[PDB]
Design goal:
This protein is α+β, with helices and mostly antiparallel strands. The chain is 46% helix and 13% strand. The strands form four sheets. Strands 1-2-3-9-6-4 form a six-stranded mixed beta sheet, with helices on both faces. Bound molecules: protoporphyrin IX containing FE, 4-ethoxybenzoic acid (81J) and chloride ion (CL). Belongs to the cytochrome P450 family.
Length: 393
Amino acid sequence: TIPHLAIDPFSLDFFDDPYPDQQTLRDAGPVVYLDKWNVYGVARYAEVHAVLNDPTTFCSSRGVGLSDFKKEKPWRPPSLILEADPPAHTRPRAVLSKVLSPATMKTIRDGFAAAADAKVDELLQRGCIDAIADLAEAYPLSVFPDAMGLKQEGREHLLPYAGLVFNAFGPPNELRQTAIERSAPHQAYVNEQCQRPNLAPGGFGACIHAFTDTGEITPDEAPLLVRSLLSAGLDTTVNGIGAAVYCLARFPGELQRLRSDPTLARNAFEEAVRFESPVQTFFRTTTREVELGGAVIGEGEKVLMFLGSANRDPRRWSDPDLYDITRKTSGHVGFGSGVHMCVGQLVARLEGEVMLSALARKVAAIDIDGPVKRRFNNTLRGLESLPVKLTPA
Ligand code: HEM
Ligand SMILES: CCOc1ccc(C(=O)O)cc1
Ligand SMILES: [Cl-]
């Protein structure tokens, strides 16, 4: 009943151009079996959405990578939020939700915006820049570690640590095994900075620790929650902003619409998240026999959700392959959906918004003027290098 496919969604060939293979995965059926890794796959919007929204049947506590925590040792202590199910999940989630709240956004907004304006000003002085190193990396590096309350020393460990985390959700290919074999210094650094004494007052980190006396989390839980933010909070935004600039570079008509109305910045970023889906994939594990899209899946099976594919499913989206900054994006699954839906999305959107606003007001054109190089990662989609010429407005 379930078609079997030999496509490796974690191969460099796939990362290099995933879209044909994603259509093959969607059109093969609502549920496929991926023989390469012995997992089920869902690539259409409807099934991806259904799976995300049934956490009881499709759990996270057995890991959201290929590895089944019931069978293998997790490479690091499990995340108390990403790799937990309700009810264990519920209070740590509530804490990070309050730490990364509307009120918090109000306190950091002017600073994040000034930094974005300053960066664009600097880049315009240079003219010819690398929009990855000099913008998509440099801008989040200039605001997020400080917002966390990290010391200056050791920050060069943060992106390596993130690349390791997102590679480790993958199968045991070379990407994953190389990451893990280089991991020790990055782990050591990150774990140390998660301790209360090492986090500056007023940062996200200290704020997590301040929540330890409410009964929601205990003091021994706070370091792992800080670890979640240091895992997820940077490299995601790097690839989101990189995606947005790439889109604007490839669709000059949309840059021009954004210039004429900079208040489109926020949606222009959201559309970039749907269109590129910097977070491509996550797994769930079935806790029982389940029927999905008229197909039956046994208990304890890994299920691979293609978020990027769901965000380009023509069953859900009109002209999915077009970057449209006035699209109604609501419902896209680039931040996930349901109880695990990105708890940091207000930070991601804030960063993305103020950067695209700065570009909207200051830049007249973005032209690719060098070879584009992709960055390969088992979970993240994005570029290594994006050489562009920026023309001032
Ligand atoms: C454009 C940037 C980002 C994208 C595309 C993104 C994507 C996602 C996705 C798809 C999930 C769902 C995982 C699942 O269902 O298993 C998620 C969860 C999560 N994200 Fe984000 N993320 C981004 C930025 C951030 C930022 C900036 C932070 C923190 C400051 C963050 C922290 C987290 C955490 C802690 C979770 C786990 C939430 C839970 O399990 O309840 N992310 N993110
Ligand atoms: C795209 C979401 O990525 C992550 C990665 C790690 C964690 C965590 O360590 O809790 C959460 C989300
Ligand atoms: Cl670690």
